[PDB]
Amino acid sequence: DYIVVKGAREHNLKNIDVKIPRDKFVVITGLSGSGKSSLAFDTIYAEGQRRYVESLEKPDVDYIDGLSPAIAIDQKTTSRNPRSTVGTVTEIYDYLRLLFARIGTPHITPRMFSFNNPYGACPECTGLGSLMRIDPDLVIPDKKLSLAQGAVRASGWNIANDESYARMYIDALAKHYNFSVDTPVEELPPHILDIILYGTNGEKIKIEYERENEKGTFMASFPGIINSMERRYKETVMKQYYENFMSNIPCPVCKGARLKKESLAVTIGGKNIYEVCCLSIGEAKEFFANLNLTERQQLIARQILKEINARLGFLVDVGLDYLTLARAAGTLSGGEAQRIRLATQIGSGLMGVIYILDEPSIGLHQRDNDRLLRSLKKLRDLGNTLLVVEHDEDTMYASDYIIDLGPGAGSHGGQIVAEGTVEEIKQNPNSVTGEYLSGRKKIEVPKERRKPNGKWLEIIGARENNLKNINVRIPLGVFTCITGVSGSGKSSLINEILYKRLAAELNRASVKPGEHDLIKGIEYLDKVIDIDQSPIGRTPRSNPATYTGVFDFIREIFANTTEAKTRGYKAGRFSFNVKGGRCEACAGDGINKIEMHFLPDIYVPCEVCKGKRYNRETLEVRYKGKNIAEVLDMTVEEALEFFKNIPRIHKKIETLYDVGLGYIKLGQSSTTLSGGEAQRVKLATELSRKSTGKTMYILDEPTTGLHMADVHRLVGILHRLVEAGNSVVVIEHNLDVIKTADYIIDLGPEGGSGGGLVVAEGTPEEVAKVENSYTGQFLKKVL
Amino acid sequence: DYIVVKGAREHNLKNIDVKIPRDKFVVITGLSGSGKSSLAFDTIYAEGQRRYVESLEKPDVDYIDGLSPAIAIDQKTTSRNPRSTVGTVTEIYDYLRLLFARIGTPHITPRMFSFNNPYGACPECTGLGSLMRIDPDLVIPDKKLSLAQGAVRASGWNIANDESYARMYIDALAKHYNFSVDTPVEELPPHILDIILYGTNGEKIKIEYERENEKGTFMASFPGIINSMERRYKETVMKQYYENFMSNIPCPVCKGARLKKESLAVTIGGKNIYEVCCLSIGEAKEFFANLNLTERQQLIARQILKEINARLGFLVDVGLDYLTLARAAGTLSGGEAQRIRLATQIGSGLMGVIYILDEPSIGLHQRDNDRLLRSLKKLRDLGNTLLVVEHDEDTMYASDYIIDLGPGAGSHGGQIVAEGTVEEIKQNPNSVTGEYLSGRKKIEVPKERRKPNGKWLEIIGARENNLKNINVRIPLGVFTCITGVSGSGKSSLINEILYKRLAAELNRASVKPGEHDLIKGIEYLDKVIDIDQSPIGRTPRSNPATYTGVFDFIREIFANTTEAKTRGYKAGRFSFNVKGGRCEACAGDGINKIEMHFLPDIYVPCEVCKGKRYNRETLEVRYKGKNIAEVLDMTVEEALEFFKNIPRIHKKIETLYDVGLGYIKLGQSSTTLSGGEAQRVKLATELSRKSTGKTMYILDEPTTGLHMADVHRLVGILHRLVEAGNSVVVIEHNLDVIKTADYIIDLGPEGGSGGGLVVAEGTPEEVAKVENSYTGQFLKKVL
DNA sequence: CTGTTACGGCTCCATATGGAGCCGTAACAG
DNA sequence: CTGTTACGGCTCCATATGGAGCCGTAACAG
Numbered sequence A, B: 001d002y003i004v005v006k007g008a009r010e011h012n013l014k015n016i017d018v019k020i021p022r023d024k025f026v027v028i029t030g031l032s033g034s035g036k037s038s039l040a041f042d043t044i045y046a047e048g049q050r051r052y053v054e055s056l057e058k059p060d061v062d063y064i065d066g067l068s069p070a071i072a073i074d075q076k077t078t079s080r081n082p083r084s085t086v087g088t089v090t091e092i093y094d095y096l097r098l099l100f101a102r103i104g105t106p107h108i109t110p111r112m113f114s115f116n117n118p119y120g121a122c123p124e125c126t127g128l129g130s131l132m133r134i135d136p137d138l139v140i141p142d143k144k145l146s147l148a149q150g151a152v153r154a155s156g157w158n159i160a161n162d163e164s165y166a167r168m169y170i171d172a173l174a175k176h177y178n179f180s181v182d183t184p185v186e187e188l189p190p191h192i193l194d195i196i197l198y199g200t201n202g203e204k205i206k207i208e209y210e211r212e213n214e215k216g217t218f219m220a221s222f223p224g225i226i227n228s229m230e231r232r233y234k235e236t237v238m239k240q241y242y243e244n245f246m247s248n249i250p251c252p253v254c255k256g257a258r259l260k261k262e263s264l265a266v267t268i269g270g271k272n273i274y275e276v277c278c279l280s281i282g283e284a285k286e287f288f289a290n291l292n293l294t295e296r297q298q299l300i301a302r303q304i305l306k307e308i309n310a311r312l313g314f315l316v317d318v319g320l321d322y323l324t325l326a327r328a329a330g331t332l333s334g335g336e337a338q339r340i341r342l343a344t345q346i347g348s349g350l351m352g353v354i355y356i357l358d359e360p361s362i363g364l365h366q367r368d369n370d371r372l373l374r375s376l377k378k379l380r381d382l383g384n385t386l387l388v389v390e391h392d393e394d395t396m397y398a399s400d401y402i403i404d405l406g407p408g409a410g411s412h413g414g415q416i417v418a419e420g421t422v423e424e425i426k427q428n429p430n431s432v433t434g435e436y437l438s439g440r441k442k443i444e445v446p447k448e449r450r451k452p453n454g455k456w457l458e459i460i461g462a463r464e465n466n467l468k469n470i471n472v473r474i475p476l477g478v479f480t481c482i483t484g485v486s487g488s489g490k491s492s493l494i495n496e497i498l499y500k501r502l503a504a505e506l507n508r509a510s511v512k513p514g515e516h517d518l519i520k521g522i523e524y525l526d527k528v529i530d531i532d533q534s535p536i537g538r539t540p541r542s543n544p545a546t547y548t549g550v551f552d553f554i555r556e557i558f559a560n561t562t563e564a565k566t567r568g569y570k571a572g573r574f575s576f577n578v579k580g581g582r583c584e585a586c587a588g589d590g591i592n593k594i595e596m597h598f599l600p601d602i603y604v605p606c607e608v609c610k611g612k613r614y615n616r617e618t619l620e621v622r623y624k625g626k627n628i629a630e631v632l633d634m635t636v637e638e639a640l641e642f643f644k645n646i647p648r649i650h651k652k653i654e655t656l657y658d659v660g661l662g663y664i665k666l667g668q669s670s671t672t673l674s675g676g677e678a679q680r681v682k683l684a685t686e687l688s689r690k691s692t693g694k695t696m697y698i699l700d701e702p703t704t705g706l707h708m709a710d711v712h713r714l715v716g717i718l719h720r721l722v723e724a725g726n727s728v729v730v731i732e733h734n735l736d737v738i739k740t741a742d743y744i745i746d747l748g749p750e751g752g753s754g755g756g757l758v759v760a761e762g763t764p765e766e767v768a769k770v771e772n773s774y775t776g777q778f779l780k781k782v783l
Numbered sequence C, D: 001c002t003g004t005t006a007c008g009g010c011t012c013c014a015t016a017t018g019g020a021g022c023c024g025t026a027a028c029a030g
């Protein structure tokens, strides 16, 4: 009953040997990058998944005894398909179909109650429920411009180059229809434009092909630009491009129900399937509980009503008390999707599986922790084991086994520091997490807080989603934290309104604004910058030294040496993305590709350059006994001491060290960077830039996957940034960040359609005095 | 701790409700087609696999509580890839690589010891170990024939039709090389033929394209027939066609080792990696056990030697004591692959998984049951549960829970007859399996056995595989059973030699014969027929009524009625594969195809014909109150009484009923037929045909997935077939079939390279008197 | 009448070019 | 000297026709 793992050396683990107990609550804690995520995901989950899949990416581990099939729950989601909804994912729609087939009355089979089968799906919308076609205005935004000027901006239909296939198709269509490309689009007859857009509907046409050395003709049909784009979207970066020219509208016949008339006719207690499926989860549970039926109906529907009640109770106990069963699963955030999946797993009944979670209490107010922990304990008691990777102080007190990694990060960290229960790690003298739990070092509350300087941002007519037509004022030049219960609409109010409008007004961005009437004070904000968890770059030619800009200065320093001047090199010669200095064998990528007869291409280190990404001639030049490869393979901590003489590089290196990246090296590929490292890199880049006093910064849950020490360091960095003159607005839930803020805006008083208004606004002391605010009560308790 | 399933209605189950205990040995027993396989595979395994996959084909079941992820072990295998071998599948090659890297001495990393990575794979053969190219003789078997006559018989390169693309390519090549297609291939210059076969190696050539209404020219390169075929095979029915023209040969450099010279240089105790990997499993285990090393080597290699010893012990305990670790996994039978997978799962250490097996004791002699049961019990004790579907009398006595289905088959069967331990089902009066276990009805041994009629089949120079140059004599006109321990070479001796040579001599088949010198007495066998478990047909237009030939007679009977003569129909008008009588809406298929926007095509019953596969005009004709659809939807049991008047149909229907197919209906699609039903259909078809007295029948394990009653019925059918004059040779392991045979040939005395000679031959009484024969000892015990 | 041989018709399965994002470089302004 | 703006070069990701097996049918022989 022990998951014994011996000889674990994946990534930066120093040959650890742990003994995780089975069927007990085990939490893994460590600093950002200490290896807490590697030990779980790269080793244990990978080994379990491989063991199961090979029966029905081997980790670098000697042997693991006692493993079980594992399921990973992470805050990742994709577009998936419009067919899948919340009701389908939660596996409640099937039971609803069974209930409607068994007890529904005409106004009776479970085959026509679903939109996934031809029996009941609406023929007009094919069961999707929203005809997503291509808007003619989006296809040709500039009707005044002629065809030669590039009226058709859609990909795959550009006639800019006469040698392109699209140009040949356009010429063939013009020949068939007796038209001229140079003629203006508006001046062209509407019939010709309609025929070009919608194609010939299979009509036979003559097409002439002209090439550099080949001439001929062939007979075929013209699908049309719109039809070809629709076919490409149906057969499908590309998805986003297709959606950019597509406008979503409800089906004219079914009115978004995505069901046939006969299926919608059957109703239970005066409400059809769509009425039940398009309400709040709490309201639906209340309606189901109060439902009354005859003795025979109760006897024949008990086995379905019990399951429906249990699943709805679990879903509302997880924390989602505002969702709608008809909501499309594509438009779900990471936290909502993760909690939906956790509820589905708790309700399915799977037994004997290792569950590996990724910070379950993400994007969730502190008032719901007492119920999320109960749900997790019920899941554990179902007959499973948990590998919850949690940092919140409220999670450790309700666990059984605590495994703390460290003691540092990167190269320093990786070894198991201390294990045991909460008390043992609390009394352990050499544990950072235990030290913070004991209260030896705590985030001290500020004494004096900044006051607004008379400049305010005004929001008028905020009515997007569930906003109840509220007006808010955000002070400028003072740290601002926007709190609120789950589903209150704060995330919408920020992202879909304020950031979008500011980007449109300042950066000339092209995004759809929110349902906001007017915004006052825009002229006082020179620039707006959004910091997210997305990686800095996807190509291998991007490193935390190139992004920060220190690489250009270091290249200039290398080129200013005596040897470089003697050999007549260039400032940019020592770069791995230009021709002349990089190793020509691998073209500067640093990894060669070898293809086998029946295997995918396997990447191996380059033999000529030995993985240094540079030629021998470039490495010949030495600066203070170090070459370009040695510098690129040196960590920031050593670089701080190495370049103390030159202040231009020293300032940026010190900024990067102060952000908290003193364990990675300047040559790490951007692919290997995680979300936290990317956020820290972006923060360092923003800090390095000169302060203009009119900068707006927006952070969306900055404490995602950060330990308490990382939270303290980020609080210090944010306060230092705010002291420079710029103002930053942060959507936060952690009480540590909230208690050190300057101005707090609270949105409530409940989630979903119940809330959406402003409850309290002002200093934290003022908010703590309001009885009708959970955030105020918690702030009073902390203070 | 109960896998409770309620409301199971998949296939032909009559709403059963069972309670399978957890972590205990559970065996499912029933007649062939009673639903024992459905309840396991279609319901429980499908539900478990779906539940697990949806977390990282919904069964028609209400709800299942307590399920766990399930792994299905079945006697199915594919070509897979040449990379995978027995050593790779068993997951021993990785530990061997680790051992060689850690303790191997030069004559040291685990990266160059594998052929799956560029570090150690042989560059010449790309790590495959056998250069499988296209033989020039196979490409052009008839060099005398000209190009126009069809010299190139390879698919995708035929020039029979001048309008084909291959013909255009051939014409372009002839124009470029100044050659004539009409010229004989032999008379053509060798250089031109070599250039055509191997392509132009990227050389630019001129190609002229001529079509019905399009004329032009283009510049490209000719890949060549051989290169195109090789590329198609690499990028890949099709596999068999590609392998037909490909001859496997060992790599000239590595001599089949598939490793680099440096990797092969390292040796342990005078033997390199290939020497250890190319020996018997028992010999390898003995060599590893006797290996000696220093104290430090023992300390650093204990963790690998222990695992290697344990895995080899498990593999030899399963029953495979003759395999070679270097054997390619493609050339493995169903039983060997299933037992390899079972050994791998027993050794991996997976815990908390439902294991669903498919007759583990398949193709295994009765002497290894006492060890196979021990291995299965060890797997169960590892912390799992088992759903072994077994029929052998030696398996029930070592089980914990017995679930018996029935009481009949098809429509009659499906309900749970009796459950409990072995004693309770034995004392149950209404259980067929319990009745046979108690001994109420048993297969009585014959009193007098047939003697050879002086005609014998002579095998001279049998040396294929492990055969030790033996000569055997098979009597003609008497039932012959070929027994032998696992791996003795009986399967090779039969399939790869006798059947192949007989087919080549009589049916003019084109297969590679075995290593046989000469065969005497071939002229005494007029026809040879092989009966296998393959389905009768794959297309939906094939039924157990069309294959037997009764459908033609029934169509003639329908056309001979008064109404058919009045309306002037045809004899073949009432068929679902011709134009005129079938429902034109679905073109006689009976299922319409509906395609959605983002879903695969979903098959639904045809609306016009309502699933009857016929038009209204055809159904208007009524014969004795029954139409063609009613007849096609009528079971054989009713058809026996219905057509008692006409003897032409009655004979075939009675034969089909006597075979044991009195539960399926004449309209069942061949896709839904299983292996046992296909074998029974083939037996009925062979029995219906007239007896010529010179027919040879070969059966390969006919008792696969048959209950004891089915075994008795098949024994009776085989004896009736033999009494007609024809002789049948059966490879059997079950003692029930063996004890009722007439002539027995025993091959031993061990498996693999140890055996291959003939031990005993003659009547079962004579064989039972030989001390050096396990089959003889078991026959003595039974008798 | 029944079996065999050959042929016709049917269904199923198999086989390079443009856009987005980033890094480097020249020019300009405070 | 430092920040900003515009442009060039590089890498990654996206989009019908023939052969095999079976069923039906005409012709022929015992």
Ligand SMILES: Nc1ncnc2c1ncn2[C@@H]1O[C@H](COP(=O)(O)OP(=O)(O)O)[C@@H](O)[C@H]1O
Residues within 6 Å of the ligand: A322, A331, A333, A363, A465, A466, A485, A486, A487, A488, A489, A490, A491, A492, A493, A751, A752, A753
């Ligand atoms: N695509 C959508 N369609 C309809 N309603 C939506 C959509 N997206 C969000 N909403 C509604 O807007 C609200 C936004 O809440 P949100 O700000 O995401 O809460 P939190 O800040 O806790 O994540 C939700 O209650 C949801 O009901």
Ligand SMILES: Nc1ncnc2c1ncn2[C@@H]1O[C@H](COP(=O)(O)OP(=O)(O)O)[C@@H](O)[C@H]1O
Residues within 6 Å of the ligand: B322, B331, B363, B465, B466, B484, B485, B486, B487, B488, B489, B490, B491, B492, B493, B751, B752, B753
């Ligand atoms: N492709 C092959 N290459 C080398 N040896 C083979 C191959 N196929 C079979 N053999 C050998 O021929 C023997 C045939 O055994 P077989 O009679 O099939 O076993 P069983 O009696 O269990 O059916 C095996 O011992 C095997 O070692």
Ligand SMILES: [Zn+2]
Residues within 6 Å of the ligand: A122, A123, A124, A125, A126, A129, A251, A252, A253, A254, A255, A258, A259
């Ligand atoms: Zn519709």
Ligand SMILES: [Zn+2]
Residues within 6 Å of the ligand: A583, A584, A585, A586, A587, A588, A590, A606, A607, A608, A609, A610, A613
């Ligand atoms: Zn290189």
Ligand SMILES: [Zn+2]
Residues within 6 Å of the ligand: B122, B123, B124, B125, B126, B129, B251, B252, B253, B254, B255, B258, B259
């Ligand atoms: Zn080789």
Ligand SMILES: [Zn+2]
Residues within 6 Å of the ligand: B583, B584, B585, B586, B587, B588, B590, B606, B607, B608, B609, B610, B613
């Ligand atoms: Zn039809």
